[PDB]
Amino acid sequence: SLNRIKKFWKEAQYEVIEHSSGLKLVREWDVLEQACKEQDCLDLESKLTKLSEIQVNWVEVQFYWLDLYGILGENLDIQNTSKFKSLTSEYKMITTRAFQFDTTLKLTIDSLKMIKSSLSTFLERQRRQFPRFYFLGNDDLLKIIGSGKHHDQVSKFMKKMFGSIESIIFFEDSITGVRSVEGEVLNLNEKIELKDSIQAQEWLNILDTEIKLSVFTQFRDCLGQLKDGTDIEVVVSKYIFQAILLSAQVMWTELVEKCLQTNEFSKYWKEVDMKIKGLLDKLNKSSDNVKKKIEALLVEYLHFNNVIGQLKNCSTKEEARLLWAKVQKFYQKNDTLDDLNSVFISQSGYLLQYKFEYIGIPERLIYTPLLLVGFATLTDSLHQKYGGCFFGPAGTGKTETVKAFGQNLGRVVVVFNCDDSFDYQVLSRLLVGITQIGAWGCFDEFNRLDEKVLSAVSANIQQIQNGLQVGKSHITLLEEETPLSPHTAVFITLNPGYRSELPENLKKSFREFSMKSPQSGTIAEMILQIMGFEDSKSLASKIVHFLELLSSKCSSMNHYHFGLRTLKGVLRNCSPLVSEFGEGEKTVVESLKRVILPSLGDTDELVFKDELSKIFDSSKAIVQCLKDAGQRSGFSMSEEFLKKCMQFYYMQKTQQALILVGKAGCGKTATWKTVIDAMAIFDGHANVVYVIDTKVLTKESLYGSMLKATLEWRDGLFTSILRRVNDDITGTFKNSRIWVVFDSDLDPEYVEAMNSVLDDNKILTLPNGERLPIPPNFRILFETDNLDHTTPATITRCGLLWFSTDVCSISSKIDHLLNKSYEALFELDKLKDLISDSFDMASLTNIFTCS
């Protein structure tokens, strides 16, 4: 044993597995450590300790040298003199060590730890000179610093860095503006000269400061134009949406006060009626970004009209004061010369200041009284330097309400849509970032946390709220004296009993609220109003009542969902069908038949048809192409099969994540195969189909695995398909359709990684860190058997299609299989005829029902 241990200790060697020069690596650590583990005894103990330290050396040098050979050894502005000399000294020393000393390797550990601490603290200099940097990881921020002269790597990371900016426009390497989510540009008051020797902090600070002063100046001149009597239609196309919104709100509040000091409302009501009618007329002919702009303005002006109409029917002055005080009002400060807080908002006699952060042009939540009460309780909690809270049933409009409040008060709330995937480090980092910036950090599904992370994050948020209440600048957090701007706050949302309430310490410093029932009537009414339909109220009441009776009188299936998200999807899907079917009841009937009909059974379908005929009143080229494609394929068009193919086609036309459910032999594979063939014949695009079974492939094969020892990544089959379709060397995927199918069950563990795909992000989440986009041409399709072990979250974010019965009769199966066998193969004619007359259905159905 001793001889073997001595031979193993004296047999120290390495292997050549690294890339380029690199570092010679060593493997098989367990055997060496076991071999390593009274003067000779203490010498052997010291040798075992040295072997463990060599293992630590190898692990840390792999983890450091991967990033070093990536960025550190080929880039200098991340280490921009002391860091220069430290990096070159450690580089030459460890290169000599790898080319060829226990105290030498201990000093190597010390030097690598010092270099790691130096680079991390350099990152904290980045995150204190500009704390929006603190959203990013270490490697991503290193890449940001390294791309100091390219000036174009910040465009793709711009969404992650701020939260509402997608790209930056450029002009001879001088900044002119930035782009929003829907193509809206945010021009600056003045351009900034990008000097050759600059670092990211200074020009990013002047960038967001000029964003603040730019929206300030645009709001000021829009207010001046509105005070000059300028009409809204000409100013919609001129300035940015944020300034237009703030000017409209300020003008509405001031004018309604100047008309509320007396008792009259008809003049401003008629004026805003003419304004919204003209705004809709301008909407009916504008482009897409202008359509979104006028959409948001018409939402807000519908809110103004609703408030004015409610105020008109007040019986007494005190009723008018009650109803006006509960509505969110906007005020202005014409006395303070500072350009940061000239505008503030007031709700129920409170005071909160605006932030001058760009929100982009998001969809605006329809202003319902429940949303106003939620805004009132949040501003009541925020007046006392407390935190708001929300708990109730799932899908009742909590996170969207928080985002709406952030958009009104003018800050991008960083939504922490948390699940089991998130760890402590990202939550702590984003919480301290929200603390330092002064941007609100909302939590989504706080009950979903594990026990120890929930307790620890509860401790962190308790400490940050305690620091907010006493108003101290410095609060101990994450083992550092992190400064706290007095404008930060924390939010939370809950779904209890599905886990627990808030803990007692958080219950002491929070205000609970419940918003269990969203008012779907007014949301549907105003979404029909903005959609341009002739009868918004009647159609909205009809669709809500129909959905309620459908939910009441259907089967209690787990895959059913008839809440508010489905109705919003219906109304967001109506408009492309509206563009060719016109505006009326017929197009919304067709949309209901297109998105809600395919998810039902058979009794549910007859109930659906009966109710649709009760409350509501009630393409040949694609059908003919599908029939020809199936006839070429050898199938037969039964009415049920052709119908289900039609809903599948009309369903894939809009959505891009379709699942299919049915028993064995139902005919789902044939359905999507013949629809793909019809698509290839009709649209002219080439069609390629990829078949994957998600259960026989493990996760380490479906996506891949990081090597814990070899430090190498292997691309899984799904990931390899994604890379080879994203690169597009042949160029086929530009003019061809890609169709990957999942012909297996639905394992939750195999779809938690798919959750990024099934969301609207169209991105792949990996343990590596690299992200590749999902093209709109990419179509994920599923082929399952039952929905017993699938979460109700995934059935809503993606479409579902149900196969109630067999798509085709028996004789269709005989004919198809006869044709297939003949394809596999004057005698043929008579043999086929005698086979056919031997296949007499009159006795065949009898023998089948007797078998």
Ligand X SMILES: Nc1ncnc2c1ncn2[C@@H]1O[C@H](COP(=O)(O)OP(=O)(O)O)[C@@H](O)[C@H]1O
Ligand Y SMILES: Nc1ncnc2c1ncn2[C@@H]1O[C@H](COP(=O)(O)OP(=O)(O)OP(=O)(O)O)[C@@H](O)[C@H]1O
| Known binding-site positions for ATP | 392-399, 662-669
Q: Which is nearer to ligand Y, 413 or 666 (CB)?
A: 666
Q: Which stretch binds other proteins (CB under 8 A): 68-76, 348-356, 716-724, 748-756?
A: 348-356
Report what 350 binds from ligand X, other proteins, ligand Y, none; CB cut-off 5-8 Å by kind: other proteins
Q: Is residue 130 within 8 Å of 201, Cβ to Cβ?
A: yes
Q: Which residue among 56, 114, 234, 322 contacts other proteins (CB under 8 A)?
A: 322
| Residue 804 in contact with ligand Y, rule: CB under 6 A | no
Single-letter amino acid, residue 774 = I
Q: With left for phi above 0 and alpha for psi between -120 and 50, is residue 594 left, alpha or beta?
A: alpha
Rounded to whole angstroms, how far apart are CA atoms 608 and 594?
13
Rounded to whole angstroms, how far apart are CA atoms 135 and 127?
9
Report what 505 binds from ligand Y, other proteins, ligand X, none; CB cut-off 5-8 Å by kind: other proteins
Q: Which is nearer to other proteins, 383 or 737 (CB)?
A: 383
The first and second tokens of residue 733, run together, are 């995927």
Q: Which stretch binds ligand X (CB under 6 A): 110-118, 128-136, 271-279, 395-403?
A: 395-403
Length of the chain: 851
Residues with Cβ within 8 Å of residue 110, at least 6 apart in sequence: none
At 512, phi and psi to the nearest 5? -80, 155
Minimum CB distance to ligand Y, residue 626 (Å): 12
Residues with Cβ within 8 Å of residue 627, at least 6 apart in sequence: 637, 642
Q: Which stretch binds ligand X (CB under 6 A): 97-105, 130-138, 346-354, 362-370?
A: 362-370
Contact mark string toward ligand X, 411..450, x via CB under 6 A? ---------------------------------x------
Q: 10 Å Cβ neighbour count for 93?
A: 14
Report what 384 binds from other proteins, ligand Y, ligand X, none; CB cut-off 5-8 Å by kind: other proteins
- Considering only residues 697 through 756, tell me which ones interact with ligand Y, judged by CB under 6 A: 743
The first and second tokens of residue 396, run together, are 């009742």
| Residue 658 in contact with ligand Y, rule: CB under 6 A | no
Q: How far is CA 358 from CA 162, 186, 213, 263, in A?
A: 10, 9, 11, 37
Q: Which is nearer to ligand Y, 111 or 633 (CB)?
A: 633
| Residue 392 in contact with other proteins, rule: CB under 8 A | yes
Burial class (CB in 10 A: 0-12, 13-18, 19+), 129: middle
Beta bridge partners of 779: 739
Q: Which residue among 94, 307, 371, 418 contacts ligand X (CB under 6 A)?
A: 371
Q: Which is nearer to other proteins, 27 or 516 (CB)?
A: 516
Minimum CB distance to ligand Y, residue 635 (Å): 4
Q: Which stretch binds other proteins (CB under 8 A): 239-247, 305-313, 507-515, 613-621?
A: 507-515
Helix, strand or coil, per DSSP, at residue 339? coil
| Residue 508 in contact with other proteins, rule: CB under 8 A | yes
Report what 800 binds from ligand X, other proteins, ligand Y, none; CB cut-off 5-8 Å by kind: none
Burial class (CB in 10 A: 0-12, 13-18, 19+), 705: middle
| Residue 521 in contact with ligand X, rule: CB under 6 A | no
Q: Which stretch binds ligand Y (CB under 6 A): 209-217, 309-317, 591-599, 662-670?
A: 662-670
Beta bridge partners of 738: 688, 778
The first and second tokens of residue 707, run together, are 């090597």
Q: Which is nearer to ligand Y, 161 or 807 (CB)?
A: 807
| Residue 505 in contact with other proteins, rule: CB under 8 A | yes
Report what 325 binds from ligand Y, ligand X, other proteins, none; CB cut-off 5-8 Å by kind: other proteins
- The tokens 């270099």 sit on which residue? 115
Q: Which stretch binds ligand Y (CB under 6 A): 130-138, 324-332, 810-818, 828-836?
A: 810-818
- The tokens 């492309």 sit on which residue? 576
Single-letter amino acid, residue 816 = H
Q: Which is nearer to ligand X, 243 or 571 (CB)?
A: 571
| Residue 397 in contact with ligand X, rule: CB under 6 A | yes
The first and second tokens of residue 578, run together, are 């509206």
Burial class (CB in 10 A: 0-12, 13-18, 19+), 492: buried
Sign of the C-alpha dihedral, residues 230, 233, 239, 241? Answer: positive
Minimum CB distance to ligand X, residue 517 (Å): 10
Fill in the DSSP letter of residue 690: E
Q: With left for phi above 0 and alpha for psi between -120 and 50, is residue 345 left, alpha or beta?
A: beta
Beta bridge partners of 799: 658
Q: Which is nearer to ligand Y, 424 or 690 (CB)?
A: 690
Minimum CB distance to other proteins, residue 497 (Å): 11
| Residue 605 in contact with ligand X, rule: CB under 6 A | no
Q: Which residue among 126, 342, 396, 656 contacts ligand X (CB under 6 A)?
A: 396
Rounded to whole angstroms, how far apart are CA atoms 815 and 599?
30
- Considering only residues 611 through 640, tell me which ones interact with ligand Y, judged by CB under 6 A: 635-636
SS3 of the chain: helix, strand, coil, percent, to 5: 55, 10, 35
Q: Which stretch binds ligand Y (CB under 6 A): 167-175, 224-232, 321-329, 667-675?
A: 667-675
Rounded to whole angstroms, how far apart are CA atoms 714 and 62?
17
Q: Which residue among 10, 150, 285, 452 contacts other proteins (CB under 8 A)?
A: 452
Single out the residue of 559, 561, 591, 592 nearest to residue 578, CA to CA: 591
Beta bridge partners of 690: 740
Minimum CB distance to other proteins, residue 410 (Å): 23
Q: Which stretch binds ligand Y (CB under 6 A): 121-129, 352-360, 400-408, 805-813?
A: 805-813
Q: 10 Å Cβ neighbour count for 691?
A: 11
Single out the residue of 408, 433, 502 nearest to residue 462, CA to CA: 502
Contact mark string toward ligand Y, 191..210, x via CB under 6 A? --------------------
Helix, strand or coil, per DSSP, at residue 687? strand
The first and second tokens of residue 622, run together, are 């694609």
Report what 685 binds from ligand Y, ligand X, other proteins, none; CB cut-off 5-8 Å by kind: none
Q: Which is nearer to ligand Y, 455 or 669 (CB)?
A: 669
Rounded to whole angstroms, how far apart are CA atoms 801 and 766?
29
Minimum CB distance to ligand Y, residue 663 (Å): 7
Q: Is residue 641 within 8 Å of 808, Cβ to Cβ?
A: yes
Beta bridge partners of 169: 177
Q: Is residue 29 within 8 Å of 77, Cβ to Cβ?
A: no
Q: Which is nearer to ligand X, 61 or 490 (CB)?
A: 490
| Residue 368 in contact with ligand X, rule: CB under 6 A | yes
Report what 184 binds from ligand Y, other proteins, ligand X, none; CB cut-off 5-8 Å by kind: none
Report what 667 binds from ligand Y, ligand X, other proteins, none; CB cut-off 5-8 Å by kind: ligand Y
Report what 523 binds from ligand Y, other proteins, ligand X, none; CB cut-off 5-8 Å by kind: ligand X
Q: Which residue among 785, 793, 796, 804 contacts ligand Y (CB under 6 A)?
A: 785
Number of residues forming the site for ligand Y (CB under 6 A): 19
Residue ranges in contact with ligand Y by CB under 6 A: 635-636, 641, 662, 664-670, 743, 783, 785, 807-808, 812-813, 816
Residue ranges in contact with ligand X by CB under 6 A: 365-366, 368, 371, 394-400, 444, 493, 518, 523, 564-565, 568
Residue ranges in contact with other proteins by CB under 8 A: 318-319, 321-322, 325-326, 348-350, 373, 376-377, 380, 383-384, 392, 452, 455, 459, 462-463, 466, 476, 503-505, 508, 511-514, 516
